[PDB]
Design an enzyme around this catalytic site. Structure first.
Site, PDB file in Angstrom:
ATOM      1  N   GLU A  35      19.883  16.451 -61.984  1.00  0.00           N
ATOM      2  CA  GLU A  35      20.383  16.248 -60.321  1.00  0.00           C
ATOM      3  C   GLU A  35      21.938  16.285 -60.386  1.00  0.00           C
ATOM      4  O   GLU A  35      22.355  16.820 -59.410  1.00  0.00           O
ATOM      5  CB  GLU A  35      19.667  15.247 -59.790  1.00  0.00           C
ATOM      6  CG  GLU A  35      18.070  15.095 -59.786  1.00  0.00           C
ATOM      7  CD  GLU A  35      17.649  16.064 -58.783  1.00  0.00           C
ATOM      8  OE1 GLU A  35      18.635  16.572 -58.142  1.00  0.00           O
ATOM      9  OE2 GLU A  35      16.540  15.931 -58.501  1.00  0.00           O
ATOM     10  N   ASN A  46      20.920  20.635 -48.421  1.00  0.00           N
ATOM     11  CA  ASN A  46      19.832  21.307 -48.473  1.00  0.00           C
ATOM     12  C   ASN A  46      19.700  22.170 -47.256  1.00  0.00           C
ATOM     13  O   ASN A  46      20.243  22.103 -46.271  1.00  0.00           O
ATOM     14  CB  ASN A  46      18.703  20.245 -48.504  1.00  0.00           C
ATOM     15  CG  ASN A  46      18.509  19.046 -49.378  1.00  0.00           C
ATOM     16  OD1 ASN A  46      18.504  17.935 -49.142  1.00  0.00           O
ATOM     17  ND2 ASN A  46      18.839  19.359 -50.790  1.00  0.00           N
ATOM     18  N   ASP A  48      17.854  22.499 -44.920  1.00  0.00           N
ATOM     19  CA  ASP A  48      17.238  22.213 -43.600  1.00  0.00           C
ATOM     20  C   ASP A  48      18.425  21.428 -42.933  1.00  0.00           C
ATOM     21  O   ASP A  48      18.292  20.641 -41.818  1.00  0.00           O
ATOM     22  CB  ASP A  48      16.051  21.264 -43.565  1.00  0.00           C
ATOM     23  CG  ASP A  48      16.103  20.318 -44.885  1.00  0.00           C
ATOM     24  OD1 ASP A  48      16.104  20.812 -46.028  1.00  0.00           O
ATOM     25  OD2 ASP A  48      16.444  19.112 -44.271  1.00  0.00           O
ATOM     26  N   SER A  50      19.806  18.648 -44.357  1.00  0.00           N
ATOM     27  CA  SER A  50      20.189  17.189 -44.972  1.00  0.00           C
ATOM     28  C   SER A  50      20.891  17.536 -46.273  1.00  0.00           C
ATOM     29  O   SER A  50      20.955  18.273 -46.837  1.00  0.00           O
ATOM     30  CB  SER A  50      18.690  16.898 -45.173  1.00  0.00           C
ATOM     31  OG  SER A  50      18.045  17.649 -45.972  1.00  0.00           O
ATOM     32  N   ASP A  52      21.739  15.616 -50.370  1.00  0.00           N
ATOM     33  CA  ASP A  52      21.473  14.872 -51.334  1.00  0.00           C
ATOM     34  C   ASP A  52      22.540  14.079 -52.089  1.00  0.00           C
ATOM     35  O   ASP A  52      23.626  14.681 -52.074  1.00  0.00           O
ATOM     36  CB  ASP A  52      20.762  15.592 -52.410  1.00  0.00           C
ATOM     37  CG  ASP A  52      19.663  16.492 -51.848  1.00  0.00           C
ATOM     38  OD1 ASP A  52      18.748  16.102 -51.164  1.00  0.00           O
ATOM     39  OD2 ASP A  52      19.609  17.466 -52.303  1.00  0.00           O
ATOM     40  N   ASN A  59      17.890  12.228 -50.921  1.00  0.00           N
ATOM     41  CA  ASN A  59      17.873  13.186 -49.865  1.00  0.00           C
ATOM     42  C   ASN A  59      18.085  12.260 -48.359  1.00  0.00           C
ATOM     43  O   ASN A  59      17.394  11.298 -48.257  1.00  0.00           O
ATOM     44  CB  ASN A  59      16.408  13.861 -49.823  1.00  0.00           C
ATOM     45  CG  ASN A  59      16.494  14.843 -48.847  1.00  0.00           C
ATOM     46  OD1 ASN A  59      17.262  15.364 -47.936  1.00  0.00           O
ATOM     47  ND2 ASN A  59      15.713  15.972 -49.018  1.00  0.00           N
TER      48      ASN A  59
END
Ligand SMILES: [Cl-]
EC number: 3.2.1.17
Length: 129
Positions: A35, A46, A48, A50, A52, A59
């Site tokens: 990650e 991300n 959309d 958002s 992380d 998230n």
């Protein structure tokens, strides 16, 4: 902060991640590696909108507040910036709520695609634990 592998294993064990919801400590170290590459300051957007955050790439769609993910929730009740600290307490405690949400560690796509079903014990091999 960029953690060493055994340094992070030690810190995750301290905070009660070893066999949390049945996931041995090597699962958590592997997910952190893919990650964030063990970097507490990692961020990634991300599609959309958002973002992380942190060593486990938590998230903002669901789990933290960053002020810029309109339709989102803050289920860990925490500012996303808190997930970037050198101290992983906030990330771990939030990851415990995520992994308890019904989908286990499949909540992390990188864990499912790169750790699940592998020899995750190798990630804590040689660590003083
Ligand atoms: Cl820590």
């Amino acid at each position: 902060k960029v953690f060493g592998r055994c340094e992070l294993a030690a810190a995750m064990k301290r905070h009660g991640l070893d066999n949390y919801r049945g996931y041995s400590l090597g699962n958590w170290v592997c997910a952190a590696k893919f990650e964030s590459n063990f970097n507490t300051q990692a961020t990634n957007r991300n599609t959309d909108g958002s973002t992380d955050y942190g060593i486990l790439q938590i998230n903002s769609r669901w789990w933290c507040n960053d002020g810029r993910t309109p339709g989102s929730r803050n289920l860990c009740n925490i500012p996303c910036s808190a997930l970037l600290s050198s101290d992983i307490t906030a990330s771990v405690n939030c990851a415990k709520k995520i992994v308890s949400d019904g989908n286990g560690m499949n909540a992390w796509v990188a864990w499912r695609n790169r750790c699940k079903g592998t020899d995750v014990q190798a990630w804590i091999r040689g660590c003083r634990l």
